[PDB]
Design a protein around this ligand. Structure first.
Ligand SMILES: Nc1ncnc2c1ncn2[C@@H]1O[C@@H]2COP(=O)(O)O[C@H]2[C@H]1O
Ligand SMILES: Nc1ncnc2c1ncn2[C@@H]1O[C@@H]2COP(=O)(O)O[C@H]2[C@H]1O
Ligand SMILES: Nc1ncnc2c1ncn2[C@@H]1O[C@@H]2COP(=O)(O)O[C@H]2[C@H]1O
Ligand SMILES: Nc1ncnc2c1ncn2[C@@H]1O[C@@H]2COP(=O)(O)O[C@H]2[C@H]1O
Lengths: 194, 193, 194, 194
């Protein structure tokens, strides 16, 4: 079908791009593996498809695609369904590979991440490593402080995450301001542990 | 024709997307029906076509496509034709299915809707009322910048034109006295609530 | 040629669009003639092509294409060539058909127009009609005043124009502020005539 | 071969555009030569490809493509690798042809350039010409002063450059403020020589 063909064609152009730029074989394989994990052999113009729909259908789709994620977290599971929809609509799906630095300590943080599937290591230089997995989130501290990252976060396994930018976080909280407290609780607890 | 082929091909992609995401059969039927009602078996890159034209032709097209909507509302039918063209230019066509919540009470409202064809049910949580062809709703929050005073749910398929609060205010920069039309309606409805 | 095929395929889409929306025959004829005059049987992804180039080549192309326009106006012919290039780069080519309102009196004006080829009729309601043609410009008054249009301007012949937005006008004049005087002289003259 | 076909098809479109606009044969050849030097017979939708990846992979790619440029400049070679990545991510690759004015004296400057390969001539009207080549940069003075260009800079040879806008320059320096000093040192030295 057309979506399988689109993946095969797009991947051929990626191979050619990597060849043109003389990328090493190991990195070429890393890109191969990334495409397999991220797109699973099919590609869609999701923006175009979703843009063809209406609000209700888009909201039904995002809620469906994120059912498990939502179930995982009391943040979403116990909230106003209109809040959950608002936040889910803003999320960006991202895949990271083992060893990737998702967050680097000391940098200016502008995104947080919700873990759909995978394990990450949180490492504050000089402190003990802590791990987070399915149904946890991280990177909230900088969304609240507008400061610098308090720890590095690396992918231990392949990680299927949803990211949320500070502007989108704040935009949603304009409508649901009391939900900020959920994130502050976590941030405070983590800052105490650090 | 290329436009029918575009629909058929675009719809196949949508089927594959729904398959990939494992969406339930009933939802897939709902999406299929949406595409049939919204696009009627043809698809166009409207933005590209309109972008190829000039101002006069774009304005002629939007006026023609909306001529019935315009005749159906004193707002537009009795107004400066240049105001009508300015407002029509900002409208976005949207189709909603029976049961859809177009507006949810209590949310921050940033759009209003003009009913070209269809019936909606308006409810403040009491006693429902209905609006149909030639009515508009959602104006209150465009004026107040507050929260929705009622939920509005499609009873039939609804062919609507939406207008964002920013586009509303932009047009009213040039035609400020037209704001009164919307305020009259909002005041009347707030009194009824 | 690919550009000729593009025109033919694009125009078939337009025909189908017009059919779908049930536009009257006379309107369809009008659209057909517009495509012929504006595109002359060929179409290019001009944005894409120019985006593939560099500054110097883009500037050479716009200067070449506007050679006659520039020669026709002391504004451009006598000016710093860097000013001319800056202004030309901002211009948008537009074609209008006989009878078209280019500007409507009393509306908020945000663009001016340079006449490459054609004749327009300038009319302030209640006043005498006058004509402008190749090498004239109009619509400058509102760029300077930020007020309402002082006259309507309608295409008499087919008009090949270049438009310039108020923001682009002001942007160029940030760098070449003394060039504002040229437009003011013309505006002052016309206001006195009105 | 999809990328080679893309170049061949894209260039046919360019030839036809030039024919439509009646460009002289010498200019057409100049455009042909530019496409050969800039794209080298292959074209990619780089924005699309990079947009399909994640942060870590994009950063790996930009670091790889620029590693020699980085090696050549103490600015980058001795810096926090996170600063280098942040700056590299903002760079735009540009190719200029012999004789091109990259910078014109007295104009409002909004970009600087890093030389990957080529020779440029710097000339302040009335002063002695100076040359710069691989591993030098120029155009920094206006990014710091927000004033007018202190010299013209012309391509002596074909020049393969990376440009950086003033807004991107300042954005990166929000995170790495002390790195502004490197550019000020160079600017000061050059202003002294002028
Ligand atoms: N002790 C901890 N346990 C779990 N997560 C942590 C801990 N310390 C820091 N983090 C997370 O690591 C993230 C690094 O980026 P932020 O500082 O924005 O937000 C931080 C927290 O979400
Ligand atoms: N009694 C009523 N009759 C008709 N429409 C109403 C009534 N009450 C509320 N509405 C509409 O329902 C809309 C809900 O969104 P708004 O509050 O923005 O604007 C409201 C009105 O347009
Ligand atoms: N007597 C006149 N002669 C030439 N041009 C005119 C005259 N009166 C008005 N105009 C032009 O018509 C334009 C209408 O839009 P503006 O008022 O922005 O700017 C106006 C002038 O450029
Ligand atoms: N003597 C010099 N040696 C090297 N580069 C110079 C000299 N004088 C000016 N420049 C460069 O020429 C550039 C022209 O644009 P800027 O003034 O923005 O920044 C200037 C410097 O980067």
């Amino acid at each position: 079908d057309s979506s399988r063909r689109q993946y095969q064609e797009k991947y051929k152009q990626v191979e050619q791009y990597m060849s043109f730029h003389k990328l090493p074989a190991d990195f070429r394989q890393k890109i191969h593996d990334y495409y397999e994990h991220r797109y699973q052999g099919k590609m869609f113009d999701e923006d175009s498809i979703l843009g063809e729909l209406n609000g209700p259908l888009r909201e039904k789709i995002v809620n469906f695609n994120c059912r498990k994620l939502v179930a995982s977290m009391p943040l979403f599971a116990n909230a106003d369904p209109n809040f959950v929809t608002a936040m889910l609509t803003k999320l960006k799906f991202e895949v990271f590979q083992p060893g990737d630095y998702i967050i680097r300590e000391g940098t200016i943080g502008k995104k947080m991440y919700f873990i759909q599937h995978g394990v990450v290591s949180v490492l504050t230089k000089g402190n003990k490593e802590m791990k987070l997995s399915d149904g946890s989130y991280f990177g909230e501290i900088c969304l609240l402080t507008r400061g610098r990252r308090t720890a590095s976060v690396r992918a231990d396994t392949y990680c299927r995450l949803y990211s949320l930018s500070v502007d989108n976080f704040n935009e949603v909280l304009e409508e649901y301001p009391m939900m900020r407290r959920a994130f502050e609780t976590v941030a405070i607890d983590r800052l105490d542990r650090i």
